[PDB]
Structures are given as C-alpha cells and as structure tokens.
Design an enzyme around this catalytic site. Structure first.
Site, PDB file in Angstrom:
ATOM      1  N   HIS A  41       0.821  -1.247   0.000  1.00 41.16           N
ATOM      2  CA  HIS A  41       0.000   0.000   0.000  1.00 41.16           C
ATOM      3  C   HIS A  41       0.848   1.287   0.000  1.00 41.16           C
ATOM      4  O   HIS A  41       0.276   2.399  -0.163  1.00 41.16           O
ATOM      5  CB  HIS A  41      -0.993  -0.031   1.127  1.00 41.16           C
ATOM      6  CG  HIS A  41      -0.431   0.110   2.498  1.00 41.16           C
ATOM      7  ND1 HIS A  41      -0.363  -0.959   3.358  1.00 41.16           N
ATOM      8  CD2 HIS A  41      -0.113   1.203   3.220  1.00 41.16           C
ATOM      9  CE1 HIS A  41       0.060  -0.527   4.533  1.00 41.16           C
ATOM     10  NE2 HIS A  41       0.227   0.773   4.470  1.00 41.16           N
ATOM     11  N   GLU A  72       0.850  -8.393   0.584  1.00 40.55           N
ATOM     12  CA  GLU A  72       1.049  -7.017   1.130  1.00 40.55           C
ATOM     13  C   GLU A  72       2.537  -6.704   1.306  1.00 40.55           C
ATOM     14  O   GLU A  72       2.804  -5.657   1.916  1.00 40.55           O
ATOM     15  CB  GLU A  72       0.285  -6.835   2.453  1.00 40.55           C
ATOM     16  CG  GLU A  72       0.026  -5.365   2.841  1.00 40.55           C
ATOM     17  CD  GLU A  72      -0.611  -4.480   1.774  1.00 40.55           C
ATOM     18  OE1 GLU A  72      -1.276  -5.040   0.887  1.00 40.55           O
ATOM     19  OE2 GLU A  72      -0.322  -3.238   1.774  1.00 40.55           O
ATOM     20  N   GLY A 146       1.384   5.529  11.047  1.00 38.57           N
ATOM     21  CA  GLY A 146       2.789   5.899  11.253  1.00 38.57           C
ATOM     22  C   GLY A 146       3.661   4.665  11.477  1.00 38.57           C
ATOM     23  O   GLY A 146       4.859   4.800  11.284  1.00 38.57           O
ATOM     24  N   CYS A 148       3.351   1.650   9.792  1.00 35.56           N
ATOM     25  CA  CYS A 148       3.401   0.690   8.662  1.00 35.56           C
ATOM     26  C   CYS A 148       4.837   0.596   8.188  1.00 35.56           C
ATOM     27  O   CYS A 148       5.564   1.625   8.064  1.00 35.56           O
ATOM     28  CB  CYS A 148       2.404   1.006   7.553  1.00 35.56           C
ATOM     29  SG  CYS A 148       0.706   0.656   8.097  1.00 35.56           S
TER      30      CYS A 148
END
Ligand SMILES: CNc1ccccc1S(C)(=O)=O
Length: 182
Positions: A41, A72, A146, A148
């Site tokens: 992402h 991911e 904050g 990730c």
C-alpha cells in the site's frame, strides 16, 4: 531494556532506511545488497526518497501467493551506492507463531520507537482494507498510523513487517527466507 530490544535495535541501526512515497513515510527494511521491503500500500513508483535522497527504483514486485492472493509485501531494488548488511539468515523458513516480539519503527514522526507486542499468532487470512490477504501475523497491541513498515522481530529472527491494525490488534505480513533467494 532486554535481549528482545537488543536484537531489534541491532536490525534498526544497520538495516532500516526511511522511505517516502506519495502515500507517506514508511520504515523500510533492507534485507541484502540493494534489496528492501515495504508494504504494498506504499505504492512504490519509478522514484522513491530514501533518507530524503531521490533514488531510482530498479525493480519493484508486489508479492502474491500461489493462490494469487495479496501478501502485502513489495520487494524493491534501489539504485543506491551502498549495500545492506545481509540479514537473510535471520528470516524464518516456514509460517509460524512466535512468543515475545518487538515492533520497531523509525520515521520523522516516530524516531527510535520500539514496542513490546507480546505473543504473535499465525492469523492467516485477513481482509486488509478490503483486500483479501494471506500470511498475516497478529499481535494484541493498538498500533496506529505511522507504524506501517515497522519491523517485527524476536531474539534471532526478523519475522514480518507491520501492514495494518483495527485499533485493538496489529497485523504484520510474514517475511520468509524463500522471498529473497537470488
Ligand atoms: C505509535 N503509537 C503511539 C504514539 C505516541 C503515543 C502513544 C502511542 S501508543 C502505541 O502507546 O498508542
């Protein structure tokens, strides 16, 4: 404060960079040579900022499992003039549960941050922001925006990167040794 924090600090001080994309600042784990990982992402493009230096992306691959399900993780090769310390020997070979993990973050907003998240479950399937995702690790800590890209470690192992939360629980994508065979 203890041997868990010791191993996390050792990884943070040599194998992380601050990555900035159009979707924000992320903790980014360097794994070997010029190869790093970041949550998919983050939407890595052709150019990324690494410690505030404009850097060409030589390759970027959004990983999926052989059921064609999102993992991911994006593996990025950076046009950087320096190699990472090779930490592939700290990666697990198989999917597993863990005791006593630390989530470690380093950004402009959260420098030198270390969180003892406790027990880590092999959760497996998660609908992550609407996207079916496999190989998710879960920990009972109220992670926020904050974190990730934060690195999840145990003593002796680098097991995952933080990719989301639900306000009560935090979720990490697994890192496996097989993702980084050259
Ligand atoms: C990154 N989260 C954070 C930041 C500042 C203050 C408190 C928290 S926490 C994890 O204890 O809810």
């Amino acid at each position: 404060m203890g041997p868990g924090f010791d191993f996390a600090q050792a990884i943070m001080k040599k194998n992380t960079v601050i990555a900035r994309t159009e979707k924000g600042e992320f903790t980014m784990l360097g794994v070997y040579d010029r190869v790093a990982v970041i949550p998919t992402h983050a939407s890595v493009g052709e150019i990324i900022y690494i410690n505030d230096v404009e850097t060409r992306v030589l390759d970027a691959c959004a990983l999926r499992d052989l059921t064609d399900t999102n993992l991911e993780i994006t593996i990025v090769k950076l046009d950087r003039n320096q190699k990472f310390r090779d930490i592939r020997h700290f990666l697990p070979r198989c999917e597993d549960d863990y005791n006593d993990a630390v989530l470690s973050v380093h950004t402009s907003k959260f420098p030198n941050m270390y969180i003892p998240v406790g027990q880590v479950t092999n959760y497996g399937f998660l609908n992550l922001g609407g996207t079916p995702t496999h190989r998710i690790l879960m920990y009972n800590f109220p992670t926020r925006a904050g974190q990730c890209g934060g690195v999840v470690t145990t003593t002796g192992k680098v097991i995952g990167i933080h990719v989301g939360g639900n306000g009560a629980q935090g979720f990490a994508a697994m890192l496996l040794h097989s993702y980084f065979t050259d």
